[PDB]
Amino acid sequence: MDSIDEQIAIKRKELQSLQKITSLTDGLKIQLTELNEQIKEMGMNADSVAQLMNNWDSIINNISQASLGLLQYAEGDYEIGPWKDSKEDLVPLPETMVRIRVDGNE
Amino acid sequence: MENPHEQVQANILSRIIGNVKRLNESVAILNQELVTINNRNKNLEIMGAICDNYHSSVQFNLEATNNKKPPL
Amino acid sequence: ISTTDKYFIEQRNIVLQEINETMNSILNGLNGLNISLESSIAVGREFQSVSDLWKTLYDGLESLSDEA
Amino acid sequence: KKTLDDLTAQQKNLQDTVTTFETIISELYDVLRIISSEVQESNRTETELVGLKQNLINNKLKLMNVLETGIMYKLEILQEQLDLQLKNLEKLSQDTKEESRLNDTKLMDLQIKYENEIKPKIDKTDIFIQEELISGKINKLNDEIKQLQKDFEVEVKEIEIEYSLLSGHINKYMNEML
Amino acid sequence: TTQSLLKESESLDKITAMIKNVTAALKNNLPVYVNQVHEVCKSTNSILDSWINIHSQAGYIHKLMSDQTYLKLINDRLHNENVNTNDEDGSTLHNVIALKKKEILDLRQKLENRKGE
Amino acid sequence: ESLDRCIDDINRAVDSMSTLYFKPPGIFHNAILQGASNKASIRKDITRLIKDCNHDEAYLLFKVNPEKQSVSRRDGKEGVFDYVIKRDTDMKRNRRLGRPGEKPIIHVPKEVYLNKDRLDLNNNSSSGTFKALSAVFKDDPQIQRLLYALENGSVLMEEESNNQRRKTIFVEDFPTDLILKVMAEVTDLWPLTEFKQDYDQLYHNYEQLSSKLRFIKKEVLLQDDRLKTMSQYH
Amino acid sequence: MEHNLSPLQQEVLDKYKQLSLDLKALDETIKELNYSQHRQQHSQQETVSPDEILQEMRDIEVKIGLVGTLLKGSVYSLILQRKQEQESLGSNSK
Amino acid sequence: NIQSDKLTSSIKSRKLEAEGIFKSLLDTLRQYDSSIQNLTRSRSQLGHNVNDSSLKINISENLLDRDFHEGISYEQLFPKGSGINESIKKSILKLNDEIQERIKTIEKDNITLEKDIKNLKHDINEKTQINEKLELELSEANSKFELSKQENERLLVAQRIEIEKMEKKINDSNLLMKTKISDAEELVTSTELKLEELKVDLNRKRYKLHQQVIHVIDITSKFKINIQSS
Amino acid sequence: MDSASKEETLEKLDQEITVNLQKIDSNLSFCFHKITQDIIPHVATYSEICERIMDSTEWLGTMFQETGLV
Amino acid sequence: MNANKQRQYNQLAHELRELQTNLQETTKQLDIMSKQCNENLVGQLGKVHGSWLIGSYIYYMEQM
Amino acid sequence: MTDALEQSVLALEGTVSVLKDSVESLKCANEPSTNLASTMLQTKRVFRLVPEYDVERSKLDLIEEVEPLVRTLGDKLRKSMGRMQRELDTLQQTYELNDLRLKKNISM
Amino acid sequence: NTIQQLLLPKIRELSDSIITLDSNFTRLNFIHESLADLNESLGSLLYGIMSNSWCVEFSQAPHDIQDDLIAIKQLKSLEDEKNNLVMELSNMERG
């Protein structure tokens, strides 16, 4: 047969290489887990900023909804106070609006 | 006839290569997504910069004149 | 010239001098008021630009009556 | 001078031609604005009016479609169903009165049998039981029973008296033997 | 002469007409105009003052939140009220400065001891 | 002559100052300024502009959707909320396609409020309630024709016989169970308490009298087969 | 001595007094318009003055820069800064 | 020669002016024929086939080609009684008035159609409340059938209940008749049989007692014989 | 040491080669699953939030570009 | 030693090298992404907009 | 052999080291961002605005459309109860009919 | 006669003064309109802000920002003292 010691040496060197590869792969595993956690918390921060940002959209809808008073009222209603021509009357507020509990608690 | 383990290793090694290839592909796809996001986010910091500038400027204005009212 | 005519002439002279001094005063006051008004227009001229570039948020009649 | 006269003729002909063309042009423009602003505008208004006419005619046709094959068909079918219900309640009342007269005829017939045949025969049975059976045949049977019982009892008592007489005679004969 | 007299007479009466016109305008139309524009500018001043007020409070909040340390303190205060909400005194800013002053007194007595050393 | 021409000039000028019109303050001007004027004024304005709704009333009239934190009408009929939010949503989607923002960014809901509030001021043809109903029931011809009938007294249904013709069918013709189910979905669409008590009263009326009637009906069926049996017997 | 003027002349003279009086009236009205003690005497109105003029309008102007000019200046500074890193990148390349 | 040159220059200027004005006239006539054709097409769209040649104006395009020694005048193209202002213009105003009175007639026809339309909504409305009253009578007829056949059933059932109770009472009456007659006859027969049985029993008892009397007599006789023989 | 035992060691090195390959396979598969099922979905949801962020504040964007011509 | 195994390890080396390059690219992209998130998404938009909103909130609540 | 093995080893080592560095940098960058996102950017929406126009319109619908609908529905339902009550009377009368006929016929 | 010749000029200058005043008030009305629409726009934005703030809650907004602010400057100074003290300590330890 072939001299045994040669294959013995080859097998131990592949052994050492393989154990090092396994260790490096475990390290890769842990780093991947930490990276996914990092990405998750950055996504959470972005979600919080989106929650902080939705207020602008809600403001836009509130203004659009309440703007109906302009064509609700008429031209002759506008001359209040100093603009009354000389020859109590519901000063022209916008479309009156109501609130509703939304958080599920009443 | 033949050392029994060899084929096993072969098969095992084959599997390794396969999944590693998938790893490659997976990672590559990630890059693409990542890359896209960055370009698609190329607007956001712009807005922020202006916003940052705006904030700074107003504070500077609030030191230019003494109209800065005390907090509550 | 008759004595009554002469008296009437001096009366017109005096009253017309009074009109002259009064109109000098009036023109001075009107010029002052007008210069102040020109100054107010000069300072207010800038507001047109900001009003236009901020009307883009909510104009109302500019677009609402556009549909009319 | 001959050239002068010829050229003068040319000039007057040119002037006449120019003024003729100018007046024709002016007339053409005037009658053209007549056609455009008055004749063609009138034709446009006429076309709009006949368009309104066609719209009114189409509305009229649609309203008759709503009328006959719509509303009048609805009136026809509604009246058909109402008339169906009306002959139906006619036959209903007819059947009601026929079965009602059958029912009251049946009841008054059987009541007459109860009161004029059943009741008199009940009374007849009653008087036959009391006057003829109870006060009559049954009572006479009881009376004959009592009379026969009395006859039997007196015969039995006479038989016992004969027994006593014979016993006394035997007792006397007993003493007579002395 | 008479004709000149009639000429000046009509001049004067028409002039009197137009001066009554201008004074009527100056008493009726002009004052309400200036009052209206003045009131509108006053309202504009009020609106802009409100704008400066919200901007000032925003700048104050930005200055306060720009600190990382205050963020840490509010964070573990949240952690604490999750752990126990009753003990407000546990996480306060005045307790923080009191413990800071205690730390500084310990520091200075250490420095004076080392100087004595 | 020059004095006369200056006279007509100043007459024209004074007329001009007569014709000048200064624009009066508008809507949001008044709202914000009175809501920031004085403590009593700010309280009155905060009461006028935003009134809190009765939680019972809001619950009875509106679905509240806590997962999306939204509010909608129970019947599903579109309101100003539906119009404004849907318009904002398809604006967002159009912008996602790279289309630019529109001017002005704030749009008054003109047409939706027009076509309805001028009608109110004056105050396919079925109203919103029946439309939402026909939406909510299935496409069964029986239920839809019952809806048609109670909307206009009787339904013009088409005869199943070979003689294709239209005939009217009235509300009593459909079974009582179907109309009760219609009323049930109606009171589901309007949880208001008066309707709920009306429904449970009426359904308890049905459950006693009509259900006992049905029991008596099956029992008379059996007892009538008994009648036929004894009639055959003698 | 009683001056016996012609009576067209006398009526014209009365025209002079009446014109005089209503010019004094107009002068009074314009003085009121330019009157500077508004609300300083017994009064409650306002007169066209720095109260409505340069004193008033610059007070609005100093604040108006917060919304109008500062907003534009922010993006202008952004553009200038963007040109700044563009020049820096060009210098790095060169 | 000065007059000759001046008049020649004026002739040349008027010549170029004549060519320009003639070109303008030809353009005007061509666009006129276009306008006339358009008007004819528009009128024919309403069925009014206007004769195009009647309104068109004919001008010779070679009129100016003649030498200038020969005169050209308005009467050549438009003699008296046939000028544009004379015949063509007046005819076109007459056509305008014809279209105007057509407009008036069509407006009257439209007003008549509108009146017929309002009368048609009137008839539709009348026939509609007729229809809804008839539907009310049909619903009322269905309901009246309901309660009507129903109360007919009610009274018919009532009469049959009365009939069946009285039939039952008559059945019990007949059973009572048969029972009472049978009981009375049975009682009479039983009393008669009891009388007969009592007659038989008492007669046999009488015979038994007589036989016992005979036995007693025999006993007495035997006792007497025994005593005497002793 | 020994001969039968040195053949035993030979088989031993074979054995830990095999199990080490098994561990390598398992760890790489776990890494692949981590990338495929966790990291990429998180990147996608981050994309969604960034879309919502840039989307909501766009009216500021129009207001800015209408004047600054950016 | 088995030539098949040798080619298997050659393929493994190629795959691991390209994996290293791809991971370095991913590291660059992730670093840039973190820069956008922490410096702009929360650094400027978040901070400034939260400042505006909270300041306006406080201002209006004090005027209840 | 060993060349390819060591090449694989060094490649994996490079990936692991770069991943360690990127993770550490990500943590350092995230810590202040996470701290800021946790506390003051927290926001709760408690109310949603509802124009009073739609509330009054819903009330008007309930009182002038749904209210008349329920009125006619109630009237027609009461006539329905009347009809079922009637058929209860007819059914009990058929019951007395059938029961009495059974009794008399069985009796004879 | 000369009376009317001297009346004419002051009428002329009064006329030019009044017409220039007319022009000035015209531009004043223009500026007033511009300011009114500016007011309406800013008021609409402010009303939107106000309505949104009257329906949202921020659980972590401070209340005594004065005390927080003076405290944070005092703390920042105390950390500055900390840095110089520790630097001196390390310097004397090294030397």
Tell me which residue has tokens 């544009």.
H84
What's D136's DSSP letter? I
Give the amino acid at K94. Answer: T
- Count of C-beta atoms within a 10 Å radius of residue D81: 19
Crossing angle of the two packed helices C3-44 and L2-53, in degrees rounded to 10 = 30
Give the amino acid at L50. Answer: M
Q: Do residues F76 and F159 share a domain?
A: no
Q: Do residues F132 and F227 share a domain?
A: yes
Q: Are K12 and A25 in contact (CB under 8 A)?
A: yes
Give the amino acid at E18. Answer: M
Identify all chain J residues contacting K30, using CB atoms and an 8 Å cutoff: 34, 38
CA distance from start to end of chain G: 108
Among H135, K60, K85, K80, smallest CA distance to F183 is for: K80
SS3 F44: helix
**Structure tokens of F97?**
């396609």
Identify all chain A residues contacting J53, using CB atoms and an 8 Å cutoff: 52, 55
Interchain contact C28–F (C-beta under 8 A): no
Selected residues 33-62 of chain I with any CB under 8 Å from a CB in chain J: 50, 53, 57
Q: How far are the Cα atoms of D26, I32, J20, J21 from residue J14, in angstroms, in the given order?
A: 96, 18, 10, 11
- Helix and strand numbers (H, E) in chain D are 5, 0
Q: How far are the Cα atoms of F172, G24, G58 from residue G35, in angstroms, in the given order?
A: 87, 15, 21
Rounded Cα–Cα distance for residues G87 and G81 (Å)? 10
**Structure tokens of L76?**
């920042």
Rounded Cα–Cα distance for residues C58 and F106 (Å)? 5
DSSP letters, D44-101, are HHHHHHHHHHHHHHHHHHHHHHHIIIIIIHHHHHHHHHHHHHHHHHHHHHHHHHHHHH
- Which region, left, alpha or beta, applies to residue F98 given φ > 0 means left and ψ of -120 to 50 means alpha? left
Length of chain B: 72
Give the amino acid at H41. Answer: R
Q: Do J64 and F36 touch (CB under 8 A)?
A: no
User: Which residue stretches of K49-66 are H helix?
Assistant: 52-61
Length of chain E: 117
User: Residue F115 belongs to what domain range?
Assistant: 55-123
Nearest to K32 among E68, E74, E78 (CB): E68
DSSP letters, E16-41, are HHHHHHHHHHHHHHHHHHHHHHHHHH
Interface residue of L38, L44, L46, L49 to substitute, partner C, most C CBs within 10 Å: L38
Give the chain E residue nearest G61 (alpha carbons). E45
**Structure tokens of I56?**
């909501």
**Structure tokens of H207?**
């015979």
Rounded Cα–Cα distance for residues E13 and G67 (Å)? 55
Interchain contact K29–J (C-beta under 8 A): yes
- Which method, experimentally, gave rise to this model? cryo-EM
**Structure tokens of F79?**
């309101």
Interchain contact F105–C (C-beta under 8 A): yes
Among B61, I46, I57, K34, smallest CA distance to J43 is for: K34
Rounded Cα–Cα distance for residues F189 and F130 (Å)? 11
Phi, psi of F71 (to 5 degrees): -135, 135
Q: How far is CA D12 from the centre of its chain?
A: 109
Q: How far is CA G19 from the centre of its chain?
A: 31
Measured between CA atoms, how close is B2 to chain J, in angstroms?
A: 12
Q: How far is CA E97 from the centre of its chain?
A: 31
* H175 occurs within a structural domain: no
D: neighbours with 3+ CB pairs under 8 Å? F, H
Q: Do J64 and F46 touch (CB under 8 A)?
A: yes
**What is the b/e burial string over E80-108, where b = at least 16 CB atoms within 10 angstroms of the residue's CB?**
eeeeeeeeeeebebeeebeebeeeeeeee
Q: How far are the Cα atoms of C31, D64, H104, H116, H137 from residue D71, in angstroms, in the given order?
A: 83, 9, 35, 18, 17
Half-sphere exposure of residue A44, counting CA atoms within 13 Å on the CB side?
A: 16
Interchain contact I32–B (C-beta under 8 A): yes
Rounded Cα–Cα distance for residues A79 and D32 (Å)? 54
DSSP letters, H110-136, are HHHHHHHHHHHHHHHHHHHHHHHHHHH
What's B65's DSSP letter? S
**Structure tokens of A7?**
């294959």
Identify all chain L residues contacting F10, using CB atoms and an 8 Å cutoff: 14-15, 18-19
Rounded Cα–Cα distance for residues G82 and B46 (Å)? 10
Q: Are E11 and L4 in contact (CB under 8 A)?
A: yes
Rounded Cα–Cα distance for residues A96 and F49 (Å)? 5
Q: How far are the Cα atoms of A24, D85, F216 from residue E34, in angstroms, in the given order?
A: 84, 84, 90
Q: Are C24 and L9 in contact (CB under 8 A)?
A: no
Q: Are K40 and L61 in contact (CB under 8 A)?
A: yes
**Structure tokens of I57?**
């504040």
* H136 occurs within a structural domain: no
**What is the b/e burial string over F174-196, where b = at least 16 CB atoms within 10 angstroms of the residue's CB?**
beeeebbebbeebbebbebeebe
**Structure tokens of G66?**
């917060």
Q: Which helix (H) or strand (E) holds F72?
A: strand F70-73
**What's the structural domain count of chain C?**
1
Rounded Cα–Cα distance for residues D138 and D130 (Å)? 9
J: neighbours with 3+ CB pairs under 8 Å? A, B, E, F, I, K, L
**What's the structural domain count of chain A?**
1
Rounded Cα–Cα distance for residues L20 and L26 (Å)? 10
Interface size B-J, in CB pairs within 8 Å, comes to: 76
HEC-encoded secondary structure of chain C: CCHHHHHHHHHHHHHHHHHHHHHHHHHHHHHHHHHHHHHHHHHHCCHHHHHHHHCCCCCCHHHHHHHC
- Count of C-beta atoms within a 10 Å radius of residue C60: 21
Nearest to E37 among F22, F32, F33 (CB): F22
Rounded Cα–Cα distance for residues K40 and K33 (Å)? 12
Among F25, G92, F159, F202, smallest CA distance to A80 is for: F25
Contacts of F65 by beta carbon, 8 Å cutoff, 6+ apart? F71, F72
Going by their DSSP bridges, the two strands F50-52 and A97-101 should be labelled as parallel
Measured between CA atoms, how close is K52 to chain J, in angstroms?
A: 21
SS3 K78: helix
Cross-strand partners of K45: L56
Q: Are A94 and F28 in contact (CB under 8 A)?
A: yes
Give the amino acid at F13. Answer: A
Q: Which helix (H) or strand (E) holds F158?
A: strand F154-158
User: Residue H45 belongs to what domain range?
Assistant: 1-77
Give the amino acid at B37. Answer: I
**Structure tokens of G70?**
């500062």
Domain ranges of chain E: 1-66, 67-117
Identify all chain D residues contacting F168, using CB atoms and an 8 Å cutoff: 77-78, 81
**Structure tokens of C4?**
């009554």
* H17 occurs within a structural domain: yes
- Which region, left, alpha or beta, applies to residue I69 given φ > 0 means left and ψ of -120 to 50 means alpha? left
Half-sphere exposure of residue G37, counting CA atoms within 13 Å on the CB side?
A: 5
Q: Are H127 and D75 in contact (CB under 8 A)?
A: yes
* A42 occurs within a structural domain: yes
Phi, psi of E91 (to 5 degrees): -125, 85
Q: Do F11 and E33 touch (CB under 8 A)?
A: no
Q: How far are the Cα atoms of E21, E29, F1, L1 from residue G23, in angstroms, in the given order?
A: 12, 19, 22, 22
Q: Do J50 and K40 touch (CB under 8 A)?
A: yes
Rounded Cα–Cα distance for residues D40 and D34 (Å)? 8
**Angstrom resolution of this structure:** 4.0
Interchain contact C57–F (C-beta under 8 A): yes
**Structure tokens of A54?**
């939705």
Q: Do residues F87 and F145 share a domain?
A: no
* A104 occurs within a structural domain: no
Identify all chain K residues contacting A55, using CB atoms and an 8 Å cutoff: 43
CB neighbour class for L60 (10 Å; exposed up to 12, middle 13-18, buried from 19): middle
**What's the structural domain count of chain F?**
3
Interface residue of L10, L18, L46 to substitute, partner C, most C CBs within 10 Å: L10
Measured between CA atoms, how close is A68 to chain C, in angstroms?
A: 10
Q: Do residues F150 and F212 share a domain?
A: yes
Q: How far are the Cα atoms of A20, F122, K16 from residue A32, in angstroms, in the given order?
A: 18, 69, 10
Length of chain C: 68
Rounded Cα–Cα distance for residues K35 and K58 (Å)? 46
SS3 L57: strand
- Which region, left, alpha or beta, applies to residue F54 given φ > 0 means left and ψ of -120 to 50 means alpha? beta
Q: How far are the Cα atoms of B17, C31, F5 from residue L21, in angstroms, in the given order?
A: 92, 10, 18
Identify all chain F residues contacting L15, using CB atoms and an 8 Å cutoff: 6-7, 9-10
Q: Does residue F104 have a cis bond before it (omega within 30 degrees)?
A: yes
Phi, psi of F70 (to 5 degrees): -115, 170
Contacts of H151 by beta carbon, 8 Å cutoff, 6+ apart? none
- Count of C-beta atoms within a 10 Å radius of residue H79: 11
CB neighbour class for D97 (10 Å; exposed up to 12, middle 13-18, buried from 19): exposed
Rounded Cα–Cα distance for residues B54 and B45 (Å)? 14
Q: How far are the Cα atoms of D57, D64, H121 from residue H126, in angstroms, in the given order?
A: 21, 14, 8
Give the chain J residue nearest A28 (alpha carbons). J23
* A106 occurs within a structural domain: no
User: Residue C14 belongs to what domain range?
Assistant: 3-67
Among A40, A46, L49, E69, smallest CA distance to J46 is for: A46
Nearest to C34 among L20, L30, L31 (CB): L20
Rounded Cα–Cα distance for residues L78 and F198 (Å)? 74
Dihedral sign computed on CA atoms, order D79, D85, D91, D93: negative
Q: What share of chain L is helix, strand, coil (3-state, %, to 5)?
A: 85, 0, 10
Last residue of a domain, one of F106, F123, F140: F123
Rounded Cα–Cα distance for residues D62 and D67 (Å)? 8
Contacts of I44 by beta carbon, 8 Å cutoff, 6+ apart? B33
**Structure tokens of G34?**
């330019």
Contacts of E94 by beta carbon, 8 Å cutoff, 6+ apart? L67, L71
